[model samples]
Target: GKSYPTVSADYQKAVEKAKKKLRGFIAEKRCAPLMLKLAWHSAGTFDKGTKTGGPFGTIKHPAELAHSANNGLDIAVRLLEPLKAEFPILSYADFYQLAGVVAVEVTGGPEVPFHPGREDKPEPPPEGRLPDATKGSDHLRDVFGKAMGLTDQDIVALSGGHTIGAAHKERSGFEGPWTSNPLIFDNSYFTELLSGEKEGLLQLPSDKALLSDPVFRPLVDKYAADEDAFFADYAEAHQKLSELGFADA
Candidate 1:
């Protein structure tokens, strides 16, 4: 339940560090999106029914580290690992969540609030808790809506995260970025989804289903038209996603 100040120098230092490292020596630098995925997958395991596997950094456990969905995230973990030794006061959960917030802001998105007090878990939760990208709108509602108690709006907002990241062929068997400018965070994801301009980009079945679903389509249209609306909703939902399965958070 702690409201942490994100303006400190140490916090910004990690942000800069991650930005530098993720923007490595390649022509296609994708550290921001991958870091965002690290944050997502790290916190995605929350189960509201049992209150287990929120943002506790359990992904470090061997079981989770080896999971198929977590492919290519080792680089993300490596990028933030040095921060732990440098700032002993922050837990792995704190670093992971903060990295996500930094990823959004540095990529031209809104500043998200940070919640402190997450602890590291010794064991990983059972696999397959996170959403399967190959699924549809009904599956999205069941996992996020029914299990985590997230609203239809929350699912749409969170899916906006696709604005920055790509589905890797080597990792998820899906390839390509959701938006033309994947490095920058904006409402173009919703725009791209609705406009059908970039329809050949290999969108996931769930991504396409968002437009067909009655509950999800309207929000997508709204966010596509209003960039500020997407930023606001995404910021709020990102915070909520980070706090899942925690009793007091």
Candidate 2:
């Protein structure tokens, strides 16, 4: 009696197709993080007040893509292009967001709950809202807190996505992957954060900010110790991020 996409065969098949494509793309174990980041940029644009973003999103347009925080995501968007063409049942919204979840699953992360039926709205949101890597505690709060209406735990848990991706000087003007193994999705990012910022790894100021706090630091510590805890919290937060503006969707 499930009322989800499992109820339909077409979307089930499309989801299956999308998964296969992502599995092949990420099977080399190197590309999962970027796809997830791509989807993050797409859905993470929600302002909560105007309902201008999230899966009713903004990434396809030039205005939002030109935002410096979104720099290097064109590759991820290009990767999803053919799959969207092949599976029109899911909107760019559902397809991109679902591809993110599948990229995480294929990379050995949480089985993030997937709900399709997201309609496409490519109208770009007001620019300059995403949290950049160089910002500090208050910057993180202003973006994820005031703008997105996400809790502190939501901010920390979702930052766990960095567990799989690296920052590049050519891209985000930062360098190094948060973890040595950038393919697998786990709490090792939390571990490395606490393990101290050393060579061959990167921790942005926002990451360091999480460590230097009363509210955000504890969750980072807890997730560092418990991979399942990170995954569990991450499942809710990631799902929430995708559905931010259109909660009932």
Candidate 3:
């Protein structure tokens, strides 16, 4: 069972306001993709072994904010900072996750269920724990699979997030969107990965590895063929991700 805040309406309003403010940066450049990355990276730091990372308001700490992996995410933080003042009851950890869920929903993705109990932390976790896009599939598994205890199916479903958002050269040294509709959330990532039409698109090496590994390819094919299945799996996995560090709590 999960515990949620009573202020769900207030939270929803704040998130919608933040999303609209984020659109000012570029014309038609919805901030959903970056918001999702903010939520993922903030929550992705959880190390199932030590259980020191994950969403604990680490973004407020200078060291964590300065981490290289978090580069270009300032836009996300700045966009949501005002909401913190507006709604003092909501923690950054909870707000970040909620914004992510709303980002997906506003962009035509599944409604990811969330439980809000995360609290702000004074100290930040160690850096360099997040997965590196520059790495390969084995690295992806070692981090997300072996370390986080996520299954191969979970990996593929989560990877479906790449269906939106492009990689920036300055940010990750990779450029271009994984799918044609980078701002929309759908199963296009799996479809494009197996479509054999990624000649011009820039995909991370780890993304290609999903197809190379026999164990992971079936998931990619399944998700590509069934949008409904992909949505269901992504929603489930994302809920797990939002609760990573708070598992014991």
Candidate 4:
């Protein structure tokens, strides 16, 4: 399952040093959610049809930056400018993902294994890959499913991200952030979906399908109906996401 070189002791030292710097970027109030969005946006740029982009941050071609799927992600990157200046070694790809790793650990979750060495290139991302928020459940499958090699289950679980932050009008052309505590990474995503209050909550037209879609409803209900199911799946999916590229740093 390995694709790159294993970490040398020196690399481990560098990672520890880098992590110390990265730790500073964790939840300094609401920052964690934005950080997660950045990671998602960075990786979400992968276009399966051409295999042009992914967490590798390779598709950052000029055309890619203008892609619709990546809408509103600039907010996350802008917030990290100071951290970028402080840690010259971290690439946007690594910084974004590592921030998630650090957030989970600092908040008493599993320690996500990380590697260091993704250097940021001048490339803007390619033109397509990130999903359309205006799209539906099937669209979710066709998009993230193709890009991340994810299944419907994985997509539903990860969508838990919706629990944290609401859609921003300026960002997604949609409005409203998800939860009051968008800062907290928990089972709220699953909880809200199953509750079905559906009266005043800011569910995106696309997002609302999870509760109604025949294909996704079971997964939604499973997470909604059981806290343990949601947490276990979220942790597993998250762990896999963290280690997909390289070995422990």
Number of backbone clashes in candidate 4: 15
Q: Tens digits of per-residue lDDT for model 1 on 15-58?
A: 55644443341114447788788888988877777877778888
Worst 10 residues of 4 by lDDT: 240-249
List the candidates' TM-scores in order. Answer: 0.87, 0.92, 0.88, 0.80
Q: Show model 1 residue runs off by greater than 4 Å.
A: 1-30, 197-200, 247-249
Q: Give the winner by TM-score.
A: 2
lDDT of each candidate versus the true structure: 0.78, 0.81, 0.78, 0.62
lDDT of 3 by residue, 208-240 (tens): 888899888888988998999999999988888
Give the TM-score comparing model 2 with the true structure, all chains together: 0.92
Q: What is the lDDT of candidate 4?
A: 0.62
Clashing pairs in 1: none
Better of 3 and 4 by TM-score: 3
Question: Which sections of candidate 4 miss by over 4 Å?
Answer: 58-65, 103-112, 117-125, 197-200, 239-249
lDDT of 2: 0.81
Alpha carbon lDDT of residue 13, candidate 1?
Answer: 65
Residue 242 local lDDT, model 3: 77
**TM-score of candidate 3 versus the correct structure, residues matched by position:** 0.88
